[PDB]
């Protein structure tokens, strides 16, 4: 029920900037721009990560305590915003949450979007200071945001570069630019490395740890939660990979993995199932901004019944996660994680 | 400078060691370490290192005292942390400003093995590495929290300064009555004569430069040395003056500087509010203001030449020499009123070596 406190946190941060030694008119331009940056990119999502903080906190309460908990929830949503803006610059996105990517806007462009990624990212730490500077968990909380972010950056790095010629640097080459798949990297082990780092830590481990830290939980439970977070991050990204091909942009709110030369679960599954001749077709057709090329890939995914293989992967993983959840021996958190698991795809 | 510079590898390796702890396949670990070693080396080294040196000197001279090797380790860590921050800012600035050369070599984002997509991700990595390093070295110090807060707050001011530098002439600031159009993705850029004044310039330049280049390094050194104290406000005022003095000289170099000497090649074609522009605008004739308006902020070399010829025509170079003398004196005047021999000594030496380093 933390949707109502958004304005407070936004305004707290905008107030900080408003204290700057700047002319009044300039300050007006600043608040106008940054009010839009926050609203445009922090709102519209399922808010799964934010809600997770609130639920964990509650199940591990006066209105002053909620203020801290909800601050941390919105801090994770602001992190999510920073990530999506950056991710859309990097992957040249078109749409995100059913509207134009921030960086594509003529009043914004790549140059502002880059600066804005940093602003959103830093605003998180200023908010945590404002609301949590006097909590004993303060240092641990900022360290958790920091470390999860580091993992995400490394995951994003691998996702971006896994098929590049440097993973198969020339500091004198600024002239000769071509995306190709590298068959050696088309396997589940590599994929899990990538997805766990890119997704699991900030989407699951972080929000859960925030709730627990603030609740006053060193304790061996933190390790168990790290392990469950990994299973969930993988479950989550594979489902994201599945929708990229077999979903409607109307539901996902975003437009392209194939033409973007991404290592995805459907590519890895197809690759392990298909004939040698189709391995050659994939190589020849993947990662090409060309209609005929992506259609070839689409057809292979249908040919090799990827829908069916996802349907049964989902079953096995959901059972493996439920089994890891039961071994936590904490009634409250177990409930939250089972609930999260149900609500994952819809919010 | 020698000691500080010899400590580089230690701090880089400590951060790389942290990434090497990640649960990744050995082969991936080796690609990671190779890429990131280069990111740090390429972008962290070859600067003047004024900001890092400033941490080291302030740390030492805040108070004549015995300082052991373990204490130095922590001061050199903070010194390299500000050099890493400078590395992050310059990779980002070169993306945003369409840089071509930085420190006499290709901008990181231009490398075909890197590109904008990696550079953006690399800005965030460099930036986050600072805090990991401060944790590795200072997490047990009482000033730990204050030190990360100072990095954070300086960075926030720098982002706002960069925002203004990039947008001061933009449609959204000029046409302040109209909201940002979130449905327009298909980019008409001109100066806004209303913004062409020293008042706006100082706002921009103090936020974009002064806080991270002077205030931050000094405050780091003093925090670490063990020092609410009302002196901070006086060092903040000195920093603002030093930041203005440093940025105006930078504006000078952008257009009158020798690229082989400065190591970089765009303010005019980027439509920036610069000191040379403000100075010409307040001295030139009416017809020349209309010429500035028509030619400024365009990529066409012939358009830039028009602006450059005006700066030659109005002897802007020489006006700079005059500003330099007056400002250096105003800064020395504020320094001598600080009443702290040790810090005054570092700042005076700083003032002397600003533009050449060392
Ligand atoms: C050069 C590349 C380096 C990049 C620099 C580091 C920053 C990139 O870090 C990365 C990495 C990968 C993806 C992303 C984002 O992709 C996502 C989109 C939607 C969702 S969602 O389902 O929650 N969805 C969206 C609305 O939220 C509610 C429902 C979740 C993610 C995710 O990140 O999990 C962000
Ligand atoms: C990481 C977060 C990204 C978002 C924050 C703003 C985006 C970056 O935009 C920003 C912002 C601030 C500064 C900058 C860079 O401007 C500078 C270039 C060189 C020098 S230098 O001659 O000393 N340099 C240092 C080493 O000596 C070699 C010469 C000084 C500055 C300065 O302006 O101080 C670019």
XYZ file of C-alpha atoms and ligand atoms in Angstrom:
775
model
C 0.000 0.000 0.000
C 3.070 2.192 -0.587
C 1.892 3.806 -3.822
C 0.689 6.850 -1.899
C 4.080 7.814 -0.453
C 5.836 8.228 -3.820
C 5.414 12.018 -3.939
C 6.914 12.418 -0.486
C 10.180 10.687 -1.400
C 10.390 12.356 -4.810
C 9.759 15.738 -3.212
C 12.229 15.090 -0.418
C 14.912 14.560 -3.049
C 13.802 17.466 -5.248
C 13.844 19.621 -2.123
C 17.531 18.786 -1.628
C 18.340 20.110 -5.107
C 16.166 23.115 -4.395
C 18.581 24.103 -1.607
C 21.427 24.526 -4.105
C 22.996 27.967 -4.567
C 21.367 28.698 -7.906
C 19.298 31.589 -9.263
C 15.559 31.199 -8.681
C 14.713 30.851 -12.383
C 17.386 28.183 -12.878
C 15.982 26.317 -9.867
C 12.581 26.320 -11.584
C 14.023 24.661 -14.695
C 15.731 22.047 -12.504
C 12.632 21.035 -10.514
C 10.581 20.907 -13.701
C 13.012 18.622 -15.491
C 13.767 16.315 -12.586
C 10.147 15.987 -11.562
C 9.559 14.584 -15.036
C 12.644 12.339 -14.944
C 11.364 10.658 -11.785
C 7.681 10.413 -12.730
C 8.280 9.226 -16.269
C 10.687 6.432 -15.326
C 9.786 5.396 -11.766
C 6.039 4.971 -12.353
C 4.174 2.489 -14.554
C 5.940 -0.714 -13.497
C 4.539 -3.684 -11.565
C 6.601 -2.480 -8.594
C 7.385 -6.089 -7.682
C 10.720 -5.161 -6.138
C 9.297 -2.321 -4.041
C 6.363 -4.403 -2.787
C 8.770 -7.193 -1.845
C 10.588 -4.880 0.542
C 7.337 -3.847 2.204
C 6.065 -7.427 2.588
C 9.330 -8.830 3.938
C 9.566 -5.981 6.446
C 5.996 -6.537 7.623
C 6.293 -10.332 7.919
C 9.788 -10.628 9.435
C 4.511 -1.344 13.126
C 4.115 2.428 13.522
C 3.940 5.018 10.748
C 7.497 6.209 11.395
C 8.746 2.687 10.715
C 6.676 2.460 7.523
C 8.300 5.697 6.387
C 11.719 4.013 6.456
C 10.476 0.795 4.889
C 8.656 2.629 2.096
C 11.686 4.841 1.464
C 13.729 1.684 0.786
C 10.962 0.291 -1.423
C 10.927 3.409 -3.583
C 14.745 3.418 -3.597
C 14.668 0.048 -5.289
C 12.096 1.271 -7.786
C 14.349 4.271 -8.496
C 17.243 1.838 -9.004
C 15.026 -0.071 -11.413
C 14.415 3.257 -13.198
C 18.138 4.019 -13.473
C 18.678 0.491 -14.860
C 15.891 0.655 -17.447
C 16.946 4.055 -18.752
C 20.540 2.827 -19.048
C 19.506 -0.512 -20.501
C 17.430 1.187 -23.178
C 20.351 3.421 -24.187
C 22.650 0.415 -24.351
C 20.333 -1.930 -26.259
C 18.759 0.888 -28.287
C 15.266 0.197 -26.904
C 12.133 1.632 -28.559
C 9.420 1.326 -25.950
C 9.403 0.670 -22.223
C 6.236 0.352 -20.152
C 4.130 1.226 -23.207
C 5.791 4.560 -23.914
C 8.879 5.908 -25.639
C 12.207 5.182 -23.956
C 13.496 8.239 -22.096
C 16.618 8.621 -24.258
C 14.614 8.739 -27.516
C 12.793 11.929 -26.500
C 13.980 14.977 -28.444
C 14.067 17.102 -25.271
C 16.279 14.449 -23.662
C 18.481 12.432 -26.060
C 21.390 10.135 -25.185
C 23.434 12.926 -23.651
C 20.777 13.775 -21.052
C 19.787 10.136 -20.530
C 23.338 9.278 -19.475
C 23.471 12.135 -16.984
C 20.018 11.114 -15.751
C 21.065 7.505 -15.053
C 23.600 8.917 -12.658
C 21.184 11.326 -11.051
C 18.598 8.622 -10.357
C 21.294 6.281 -9.073
C 22.692 8.843 -6.651
C 19.237 10.007 -5.474
C 18.855 6.569 -3.882
C 21.714 7.225 -1.502
C 20.519 10.719 -0.627
C 17.052 9.375 0.243
C 18.450 6.577 2.409
C 20.471 9.206 4.235
C 17.417 11.419 4.751
C 15.263 8.656 6.198
C 17.722 6.092 7.604
C 20.904 7.951 8.574
C 20.186 7.272 12.259
C 19.284 3.586 11.950
C 21.903 1.066 13.049
C 21.332 -0.845 9.800
C 22.250 2.264 7.783
C 25.731 1.192 6.672
C 24.671 -2.380 5.847
C 21.757 -1.095 3.746
C 23.912 1.185 1.591
C 26.472 -1.579 1.202
C 23.724 -3.934 0.025
C 22.550 -1.439 -2.629
C 26.157 -0.884 -3.665
C 27.139 -4.526 -3.952
C 23.972 -5.576 -5.745
C 24.544 -2.764 -8.212
C 28.116 -3.961 -8.823
C 26.880 -7.451 -9.629
C 24.251 -6.032 -11.979
C 26.842 -3.979 -13.855
C 29.004 -7.071 -14.321
C 25.968 -9.059 -15.455
C 25.032 -6.271 -17.859
C 28.649 -6.268 -19.113
C 28.580 -9.995 -19.905
C 25.139 -9.768 -21.490
C 26.436 -6.988 -23.751
C 29.730 -8.607 -24.684
C 29.333 -12.369 -24.499
C 29.189 -12.711 -28.317
C 31.769 -10.012 -29.062
C 35.158 -10.634 -30.634
C 36.939 -9.760 -27.382
C 35.229 -12.647 -25.554
C 36.186 -15.131 -28.295
C 41.149 -4.859 -26.991
C 42.384 -2.720 -29.893
C 42.900 0.804 -28.549
C 43.817 2.011 -32.038
C 40.566 0.975 -33.727
C 37.877 3.622 -33.940
C 37.094 2.930 -37.594
C 36.283 -0.732 -38.256
C 32.998 -1.670 -36.512
C 29.475 -6.677 -36.860
C 27.366 -8.755 -34.455
C 27.709 -12.542 -34.741
C 26.896 -15.433 -32.428
C 29.739 -17.397 -30.831
C 28.610 -21.024 -30.540
C 30.994 -21.725 -27.653
C 28.953 -19.388 -25.450
C 25.593 -20.868 -26.291
C 25.132 -22.907 -23.131
C 23.219 -22.877 -19.881
C 26.232 -22.493 -17.589
C 27.282 -19.251 -19.245
C 23.658 -18.115 -19.323
C 23.176 -18.657 -15.587
C 26.332 -16.702 -14.793
C 24.906 -13.847 -16.804
C 21.341 -13.902 -15.509
C 22.167 -14.363 -11.817
C 24.440 -11.316 -11.882
C 22.277 -9.176 -14.164
C 18.930 -9.935 -12.453
C 18.990 -12.046 -9.263
C 20.872 -9.696 -6.997
C 18.995 -6.452 -7.471
C 15.557 -7.958 -8.181
C 15.389 -10.461 -5.328
C 18.363 -10.492 -2.968
C 18.464 -6.711 -2.495
C 14.805 -6.014 -1.652
C 14.661 -9.043 0.653
C 17.833 -8.040 2.513
C 16.557 -4.470 2.893
C 13.395 -5.732 4.582
C 15.360 -8.042 6.845
C 18.060 -5.532 7.799
C 15.512 -2.898 8.662
C 13.569 -5.532 10.620
C 16.697 -6.164 12.719
C 17.982 -9.485 11.396
C 25.470 -12.396 10.334
C 22.470 -14.709 10.581
C 22.884 -17.787 8.375
C 19.472 -17.070 6.869
C 21.105 -14.464 4.607
C 22.956 -17.163 2.723
C 19.791 -19.221 2.240
C 18.090 -16.118 0.876
C 20.967 -15.569 -1.529
C 20.491 -19.082 -2.880
C 16.742 -18.670 -3.338
C 17.358 -15.298 -5.000
C 19.523 -17.025 -7.585
C 16.837 -19.600 -8.427
C 14.275 -16.805 -8.710
C 16.434 -14.500 -10.824
C 16.938 -17.333 -13.286
C 13.225 -18.219 -13.311
C 12.417 -14.534 -13.859
C 14.824 -13.872 -16.753
C 13.929 -17.066 -18.594
C 10.295 -16.029 -18.436
C 11.363 -12.580 -19.732
C 13.223 -14.315 -22.577
C 10.095 -16.349 -23.359
C 7.833 -13.296 -23.638
C 10.250 -11.409 -25.902
C 9.286 -13.888 -28.634
C 5.950 -15.377 -27.528
C 4.243 -12.301 -26.078
C 2.339 -9.142 -26.982
C 4.064 -5.776 -26.548
C 0.682 -4.664 -25.204
C 1.222 -6.846 -22.142
C 4.990 -6.353 -21.793
C 4.959 -2.648 -22.616
C 8.169 -3.064 -24.644
C 9.140 -4.005 -28.210
C 13.809 -7.583 -30.290
C 16.218 -10.089 -28.657
C 16.900 -11.911 -31.927
C 17.900 -8.912 -34.024
C 19.787 -7.643 -30.978
C 22.032 -10.728 -30.944
C 21.195 -11.601 -27.325
C 22.032 -14.835 -25.544
C 18.567 -16.035 -24.546
C 17.065 -19.186 -23.073
C 15.134 -19.968 -26.266
C 18.358 -19.729 -28.303
C 20.204 -22.074 -25.921
C 17.323 -24.565 -25.785
C 16.850 -24.569 -29.537
C 20.599 -24.961 -30.000
C 20.747 -28.055 -27.813
C 17.710 -29.616 -29.537
C 18.290 -28.848 -33.182
C 19.937 -30.635 -36.091
C 23.371 -29.622 -37.354
C 21.810 -27.979 -40.400
C 19.624 -25.755 -38.219
C 22.640 -24.760 -36.135
C 24.033 -23.342 -39.380
C 20.720 -21.581 -40.104
C 20.738 -20.015 -36.632
C 24.303 -18.757 -37.074
C 23.463 -17.330 -40.487
C 20.195 -15.712 -39.374
C 20.588 -14.613 -35.732
C 21.511 -11.061 -34.749
C 20.421 -9.537 -38.051
C 18.215 -6.477 -38.364
C 16.372 -8.041 -41.272
C 12.774 -9.230 -41.409
C 13.411 -12.469 -43.261
C 16.224 -13.315 -40.842
C 14.224 -12.950 -37.621
C 11.315 -14.844 -39.169
C 13.697 -17.760 -39.773
C 14.558 -17.740 -36.073
C 10.895 -17.383 -35.032
C 10.114 -20.435 -37.153
C 12.865 -22.510 -35.569
C 11.520 -21.663 -32.118
C 8.076 -22.866 -33.199
C 9.563 -25.846 -35.035
C 11.413 -26.938 -31.910
C 8.375 -26.443 -29.667
C 10.051 -23.853 -27.441
C 6.648 -22.989 -25.940
C 6.387 -26.572 -24.691
C 9.920 -26.665 -23.328
C 9.342 -23.406 -21.463
C 6.054 -24.698 -20.061
C 7.868 -27.655 -18.513
C 10.969 -25.725 -17.436
C 8.674 -23.365 -15.512
C 7.134 -26.345 -13.678
C 10.442 -27.891 -12.641
C 11.946 -24.561 -11.484
C 8.856 -23.500 -9.532
C 9.085 -26.802 -7.645
C 12.809 -26.386 -7.012
C 12.230 -22.880 -5.649
C 9.329 -23.976 -3.434
C 11.609 -26.657 -1.993
C 14.342 -24.126 -1.263
C 11.740 -21.863 0.323
C 10.531 -24.556 2.751
C 14.061 -25.082 4.086
C 14.240 -21.482 5.356
C 12.454 -22.198 8.651
C 10.954 -18.746 8.846
C 7.182 -18.740 8.525
C 6.822 -15.056 7.593
C 9.456 -14.896 4.862
C 8.306 -18.231 3.452
C 4.816 -16.841 3.017
C 6.114 -13.701 1.256
C 8.251 -15.711 -1.162
C 5.408 -18.073 -2.045
C 3.230 -15.017 -2.590
C 5.934 -13.265 -4.659
C 6.226 -16.431 -6.722
C 2.505 -16.399 -7.570
C 2.414 -12.688 -8.351
C 5.741 -12.568 -10.178
C 4.557 -12.187 -13.780
C 1.544 -9.952 -13.077
C 2.513 -7.920 -10.006
C 53.246 12.621 -6.750
C 55.654 9.674 -6.913
C 54.322 7.821 -3.855
C 50.681 8.491 -4.806
C 51.325 7.282 -8.363
C 53.171 4.151 -7.230
C 50.142 3.170 -5.127
C 47.860 3.009 -8.180
C 48.235 -0.708 -8.899
C 47.382 -1.648 -5.329
C 44.007 0.113 -5.395
C 43.174 -1.076 -8.895
C 44.108 -4.668 -8.008
C 42.085 -4.546 -4.814
C 38.957 -3.611 -6.769
C 39.679 -6.189 -9.484
C 40.189 -8.786 -6.740
C 36.694 -8.019 -5.519
C 35.190 -8.806 -8.954
C 37.338 -11.922 -9.121
C 35.481 -13.209 -6.055
C 32.214 -13.432 -8.059
C 30.749 -16.868 -8.768
C 31.647 -17.059 -12.448
C 33.278 -19.597 -14.749
C 37.063 -19.230 -14.714
C 37.205 -18.232 -18.391
C 34.629 -15.475 -17.836
C 36.656 -14.289 -14.840
C 39.694 -13.869 -17.041
C 37.823 -11.891 -19.696
C 36.340 -9.726 -16.966
C 39.713 -9.012 -15.379
C 41.314 -8.225 -18.726
C 38.558 -5.789 -19.799
C 38.430 -3.992 -16.470
C 42.174 -3.707 -15.979
C 42.211 -1.826 -19.280
C 39.184 0.347 -18.377
C 41.008 1.573 -15.279
C 44.441 1.976 -16.883
C 43.114 3.644 -20.017
C 41.003 6.229 -18.229
C 42.631 6.672 -14.818
C 46.226 7.292 -15.893
C 47.850 10.162 -17.784
C 45.991 13.003 -16.094
C 47.595 15.901 -14.237
C 46.298 14.315 -11.002
C 45.700 17.718 -9.389
C 42.714 16.426 -7.443
C 44.501 13.333 -6.077
C 47.602 15.308 -5.155
C 45.374 17.797 -3.364
C 44.040 15.052 -1.080
C 47.579 13.951 -0.234
C 48.904 17.440 0.503
C 45.904 18.528 2.548
C 46.054 15.284 4.521
C 49.689 15.929 5.390
C 49.519 19.674 6.046
C 46.246 19.938 7.956
C 48.466 19.375 10.985
C 52.165 18.662 11.402
C 52.057 15.177 12.900
C 53.423 11.654 12.776
C 51.627 9.731 10.026
C 52.301 6.029 9.706
C 52.310 3.906 6.558
C 48.877 2.400 7.324
C 47.393 5.876 7.608
C 48.914 6.875 4.269
C 47.342 3.839 2.631
C 43.950 5.270 3.519
C 44.834 8.746 2.260
C 46.213 7.433 -1.038
C 43.037 5.352 -1.430
C 40.913 8.492 -1.185
C 43.321 10.263 -3.567
C 42.895 7.547 -6.182
C 39.159 7.500 -5.538
C 38.937 11.112 -6.729
C 41.052 10.170 -9.767
C 38.646 7.317 -10.474
C 35.746 9.786 -10.172
C 37.501 12.093 -12.648
C 37.936 9.046 -14.923
C 34.184 8.323 -14.704
C 33.251 11.962 -15.362
C 35.492 12.213 -18.399
C 34.282 9.001 -20.020
C 30.714 10.273 -19.527
C 31.476 13.815 -20.672
C 33.103 12.507 -23.863
C 29.946 10.509 -24.604
C 27.683 13.474 -23.928
C 29.838 16.134 -25.637
C 30.875 13.895 -28.545
C 34.559 13.971 -27.606
C 37.226 12.794 -30.009
C 40.451 12.933 -28.003
C 41.101 12.854 -24.285
C 44.579 12.959 -22.794
C 46.049 12.645 -26.287
C 44.258 9.437 -27.246
C 40.918 8.237 -28.585
C 37.994 8.658 -26.213
C 37.056 5.338 -24.640
C 33.522 5.327 -26.118
C 34.903 5.618 -29.676
C 36.803 2.333 -29.503
C 34.995 -0.221 -31.658
C 35.560 -2.878 -28.959
C 33.806 -0.554 -26.491
C 31.248 1.744 -28.094
C 28.671 3.890 -26.296
C 26.840 0.899 -24.837
C 29.896 -0.309 -22.914
C 31.030 3.195 -22.041
C 27.730 3.959 -20.322
C 28.012 0.743 -18.331
C 31.663 1.530 -17.598
C 30.823 4.964 -16.188
C 28.644 3.257 -13.580
C 31.334 0.694 -12.797
C 34.093 3.238 -12.263
C 31.729 5.329 -10.158
C 30.704 2.397 -7.992
C 34.306 1.163 -7.618
C 35.085 4.312 -5.610
C 32.697 3.312 -2.834
C 33.888 -0.295 -2.773
C 37.460 0.968 -2.359
C 36.486 3.350 0.437
C 34.829 0.372 2.124
C 37.876 -1.863 1.670
C 40.177 0.773 3.225
C 38.123 3.025 5.507
C 35.092 1.072 6.681
C 36.455 1.034 10.261
C 37.377 4.722 10.410
C 35.033 7.044 12.290
C 34.929 9.419 9.299
C 33.772 6.623 6.965
C 30.142 7.710 6.673
C 31.057 11.395 6.325
C 33.555 10.544 3.575
C 31.059 8.651 1.422
C 28.480 11.411 2.013
C 30.978 14.004 0.702
C 31.648 11.951 -2.441
C 27.878 11.549 -2.916
C 26.987 15.210 -2.414
C 29.833 16.466 -4.627
C 28.735 14.094 -7.372
C 25.122 15.297 -7.131
C 26.259 18.925 -7.564
C 28.416 17.911 -10.549
C 25.479 16.125 -12.227
C 23.286 19.220 -11.806
C 26.116 21.398 -13.151
C 26.487 19.100 -16.148
C 22.726 19.121 -16.653
C 22.786 22.931 -16.858
C 25.906 23.039 -19.052
C 24.137 20.722 -21.511
C 20.671 22.350 -21.381
C 21.090 26.052 -20.614
C 20.294 26.959 -24.257
C 17.845 24.123 -24.943
C 14.281 24.593 -26.180
C 12.880 23.431 -22.838
C 14.691 26.188 -20.919
C 14.110 28.903 -23.558
C 10.458 27.953 -24.044
C 9.922 27.500 -20.294
C 6.167 27.893 -20.773
C 5.893 24.630 -22.712
C 6.155 21.192 -21.112
C 8.651 18.594 -22.317
C 6.886 16.799 -25.179
C 7.004 13.092 -24.287
C 5.602 12.177 -27.705
C 8.293 13.768 -29.846
C 11.098 11.446 -30.954
C 11.814 12.907 -34.419
C 15.432 17.541 -33.097
C 15.689 21.124 -34.411
C 19.826 24.438 -31.362
C 20.476 28.140 -30.854
C 21.779 30.388 -28.093
C 19.317 32.119 -25.767
C 20.653 35.652 -25.281
C 18.825 35.807 -21.931
C 21.160 33.159 -20.487
C 24.320 34.842 -21.715
C 25.546 36.396 -18.477
C 28.179 35.827 -15.836
C 25.539 35.104 -13.168
C 24.295 32.022 -14.998
C 27.813 30.985 -15.931
C 28.983 30.970 -12.301
C 25.912 28.931 -11.275
C 26.799 26.342 -13.918
C 30.544 26.330 -13.490
C 30.559 26.156 -9.683
C 28.331 23.095 -9.759
C 30.011 21.389 -12.705
C 33.578 21.850 -11.468
C 34.196 23.490 -8.093
C 32.652 20.888 -5.808
C 34.418 17.779 -7.054
C 37.697 19.343 -8.159
C 38.446 21.407 -5.050
C 35.915 21.151 -2.254
C 35.770 17.339 -2.277
C 39.532 16.620 -2.256
C 40.175 19.162 0.507
C 37.297 17.947 2.657
C 38.468 14.346 2.186
C 41.938 15.203 3.448
C 40.564 17.106 6.446
C 37.923 14.506 7.345
C 40.540 11.758 7.273
C 42.971 13.888 9.330
C 40.368 14.220 12.075
C 38.578 17.562 12.026
C 30.661 21.024 12.417
C 33.940 22.973 12.231
C 33.133 26.402 10.780
C 36.270 26.396 8.603
C 34.624 24.139 6.034
C 32.389 27.000 4.889
C 35.458 29.162 4.264
C 37.137 26.412 2.231
C 33.897 26.032 0.292
C 34.005 29.722 -0.708
C 37.653 29.358 -1.793
C 36.722 26.251 -3.804
C 33.965 28.086 -5.674
C 36.487 30.763 -6.699
C 39.041 28.101 -7.669
C 36.402 26.230 -9.678
C 35.419 29.341 -11.605
C 39.100 30.141 -12.249
C 39.784 26.600 -13.435
C 36.757 26.343 -15.756
C 37.315 29.700 -17.435
C 40.881 28.634 -18.191
C 39.411 25.396 -19.562
C 37.031 27.403 -21.789
C 40.105 29.345 -22.925
C 41.945 26.157 -23.906
C 38.988 24.674 -25.765
C 39.256 27.393 -28.408
C 42.718 28.998 -28.080
C 44.507 25.880 -26.812
C 46.811 23.576 -28.743
C 45.115 20.165 -28.987
C 48.487 18.379 -28.920
C 49.186 20.145 -25.619
C 45.724 19.890 -24.027
C 45.151 16.373 -25.335
C 41.608 17.159 -26.503
C 39.818 18.743 -29.469
C 33.900 21.557 -29.453
C 32.245 24.083 -27.112
C 31.119 26.292 -30.003
C 29.595 23.501 -32.101
C 28.149 21.999 -28.935
C 26.279 25.209 -28.177
C 27.899 25.706 -24.759
C 27.754 28.805 -22.576
C 31.418 29.733 -22.360
C 33.434 32.588 -20.911
C 34.710 33.532 -24.362
C 31.094 33.781 -25.552
C 29.934 35.897 -22.622
C 32.921 38.208 -22.964
C 32.352 38.749 -26.697
C 28.648 39.212 -26.201
C 29.073 42.071 -23.725
C 31.734 43.848 -25.822
C 30.633 43.376 -29.447
C 28.359 45.435 -31.737
C 24.700 44.781 -32.553
C 25.446 43.313 -35.978
C 27.992 40.987 -34.381
C 25.417 39.733 -31.859
C 23.148 38.739 -34.722
C 26.100 37.018 -36.373
C 26.823 35.108 -33.148
C 23.168 34.049 -32.943
C 23.189 32.774 -36.539
C 26.460 30.849 -36.379
C 26.828 29.534 -32.823
C 25.978 25.908 -31.993
C 26.406 24.534 -35.508
C 28.673 21.693 -36.679
C 29.537 23.431 -39.936
C 33.214 24.378 -39.779
C 32.441 27.627 -41.612
C 30.012 28.540 -38.839
C 32.615 27.812 -36.162
C 35.169 29.873 -38.098
C 32.816 32.854 -37.916
C 32.729 32.566 -34.122
C 36.470 31.963 -33.878
C 37.207 34.987 -36.080
C 35.102 37.140 -33.773
C 37.101 35.979 -30.763
C 40.220 36.980 -32.724
C 38.600 40.254 -33.796
C 37.650 41.172 -30.217
C 40.986 39.973 -28.809
C 39.374 37.521 -26.383
C 42.705 35.803 -25.612
C 44.048 39.045 -24.177
C 40.884 39.618 -22.139
C 41.560 36.224 -20.558
C 45.076 37.178 -19.418
C 43.426 40.066 -17.589
C 40.786 37.911 -15.918
C 43.507 35.464 -14.892
C 45.433 38.144 -13.006
C 42.414 39.577 -11.200
C 40.994 36.193 -10.202
C 44.281 34.692 -9.021
C 44.552 37.739 -6.751
C 41.004 37.427 -5.462
C 41.760 33.766 -4.689
C 45.060 34.510 -2.956
C 43.203 37.170 -0.984
C 40.623 34.664 0.271
C 43.293 32.065 1.051
C 45.316 34.451 3.254
C 42.145 35.127 5.265
C 41.690 31.437 6.120
C 43.988 31.616 9.158
C 45.378 28.111 8.803
C 49.022 28.188 7.765
C 49.083 24.529 6.718
C 46.033 24.617 4.456
C 46.945 28.063 3.043
C 50.337 26.651 2.108
C 48.769 23.798 0.119
C 46.251 26.006 -1.682
C 48.866 28.603 -2.678
C 51.012 25.828 -4.072
C 47.883 24.448 -5.729
C 47.170 27.796 -7.330
C 50.695 27.904 -8.741
C 50.599 24.479 -10.361
C 46.930 24.259 -11.474
C 47.432 24.417 -15.229
C 50.564 22.311 -15.627
C 50.216 19.970 -12.661
C 52.916 18.549 -10.384
C 25.896 -2.258 -21.542
C 24.773 -2.671 -20.586
C 25.106 -2.278 -19.141
C 23.869 -1.774 -18.379
C 24.258 -0.910 -17.167
C 23.637 -1.456 -15.881
C 22.137 -1.189 -15.874
C 21.384 -2.256 -16.662
O 20.884 -3.207 -15.717
C 19.950 -3.984 -16.318
C 20.328 -5.177 -16.921
C 19.391 -5.946 -17.603
C 18.070 -5.520 -17.657
C 17.696 -4.327 -17.050
C 16.366 -3.958 -17.085
O 15.478 -4.897 -17.694
C 14.331 -5.110 -16.994
C 13.139 -4.734 -17.600
C 11.926 -4.992 -16.984
C 11.902 -5.604 -15.740
S 10.378 -5.990 -15.007
O 9.983 -7.368 -15.449
O 10.501 -5.933 -13.512
N 9.207 -5.002 -15.537
C 9.657 -3.680 -15.953
C 8.777 -2.673 -15.268
O 9.187 -3.162 -14.045
C 8.092 -3.940 -13.621
C 8.001 -5.004 -14.688
C 13.079 -6.074 -15.176
C 14.303 -5.842 -15.799
C 15.591 -6.358 -15.111
O 16.646 -5.693 -15.244
O 15.500 -7.393 -14.407
C 18.627 -3.567 -16.364
C 30.381 9.944 -13.062
C 28.973 10.556 -13.076
C 28.605 11.042 -14.484
C 27.602 12.199 -14.437
C 28.221 13.466 -13.824
C 28.465 14.529 -14.894
C 28.821 13.864 -16.222
C 30.286 14.123 -16.571
O 30.409 15.476 -17.033
C 31.427 16.089 -16.380
C 31.226 16.589 -15.101
C 32.275 17.213 -14.435
C 33.521 17.315 -15.040
C 33.729 16.782 -16.304
C 34.969 16.910 -16.908
O 35.485 18.231 -17.115
C 36.809 18.287 -16.801
C 37.729 17.700 -17.659
C 39.085 17.798 -17.386
C 39.535 18.496 -16.271
S 41.248 18.414 -15.937
O 42.014 19.429 -16.749
O 41.554 18.546 -14.477
N 41.643 16.928 -16.396
C 41.662 16.020 -15.234
C 42.800 15.047 -15.330
O 43.712 15.938 -15.943
C 43.428 15.550 -17.227
C 42.725 16.875 -17.368
C 38.615 19.042 -15.381
C 37.250 18.983 -15.673
C 36.235 19.636 -14.726
O 35.134 20.014 -15.197
O 36.550 19.730 -13.520
C 32.670 16.207 -16.994
